[PDB]
Symmetry: C2
Subunit: 142 residues, 2 copies
C-alpha cells in the first residue's frame, strides 16, 4: 500500500529548528563533554543556576521547556558530583562555579563564531523573528 | 559571582527554548491522543518518510542523542507501533501518523500565521545560513 507523506520534515519549521538546536548544542558540548564528563542537560542546569541562584528543578524545566525527568536526572547527577547544592532551592557550589568560569568563556567564543556569518542587521532580524514566534506565535498553537 | 553567559540574550539558548516550546505545544496533540512522548513521535515521523531506517540512521538525521532514540525505538516496539535492523511502522503506527500529522500541520500553520509569506521566507533563509555556514564555524 502507498505511504502518503504528511509532514515534509526538511521544510517543516519545528523540525528544522529542533535539528539545528541539537547540532548547536552538540558543538558546544565539545568544549566540556569529555573534559568534565558532563552531559548537555547538566551544563544547562549549571548555566541556569549561575544566572538564577536559588531556582528549583521545577523552575529550571519551566523556563527551558525541557523534559522534567531529564532535568531531575541532571540535577541528581550534579548533586552527586558536588557541582551544585541544595539550600527545593538549588545553587552552584564553588566546584561547580569553577567549572562554569572555565567553560563559559569558551562557549561564548564558539557562539561568537557561529553568529559571525551574519551581519549586525541579519542578527537583529533573526532575534526579532524569534521573539515574534515566542510572543505571538506560541499562543496561537493550542 | 559574575554571570559569564547571559542566557536571556544568548542565541543558542533562545533558539533551544523556542524549539522546545514549539515541540511541547505540538506534543499535546499526540500526548493526549496516544500518551506518546516527543522522541517517540519524532521517530514515527522519520520512519513514515524513510521506511527501513535504523536507530542510528534516525539519530544522524535528527541530531538527537543516540540513547534517546534507542529508548524511543524500544518503547515503540513494545507498544506495537513499529516492527522489525530495519525499522518500519506497523499498521497501528501508520494510523497514529495519519491521525496526528494533519493536526500537527494545522497547528504549525497557526504558529506561522504571525508572519507574512515574505517574513517566513526570511526566517527560513537565516536558519539555512546558520546551518550551512554557522555550524562549521563553531567546530
Ligand atoms: Cl513534528
Ligand atoms: Cl550553552
Amino acid at each position: 500500500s502507498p505511504h502518503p507523506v504528511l509532514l515534509n520534515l526538511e521544510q517543516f519549521l519545528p523540525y528544522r529548528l529542533s535539528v539545528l538546536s541539537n547540532r548547536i548544542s552538540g558543538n558546544i558540548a565539545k568544549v566540556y563533554g569529555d573534559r568534565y564528563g558532563m552531559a548537555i542537560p547538566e551544563w544547562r542546569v549549571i548555566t541556569i543556576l549561575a544566572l538564577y541562584p536559588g531556582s528549583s528543578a521545577s523552575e529550571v524545566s519551566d523556563r527551558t521547556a525541557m523534559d522534567k525527568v531529564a532535568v531531575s536526572r541532571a540535577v541528581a547527577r550534579l548533586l552527586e558530583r558536588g557541582f551544585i547544592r541544595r539550600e527545593s532551592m538549588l545553587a552552584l557550589s564553588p566546584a561547580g562555579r569553577q567549572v562554569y568560569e572555565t567553560v563559559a568563556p569558551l562557549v561564548n567564543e564558539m557562539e561568537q563564531r557561529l553568529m559571525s556569518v551574519f551581519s549586525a542587521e541579519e542578527q537583529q532580524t533573526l532575534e526579532r523573528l524569534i521573539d515574534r514566534l515566542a510572543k505571538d506565535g506560541l499562543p496561537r498553537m493550542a
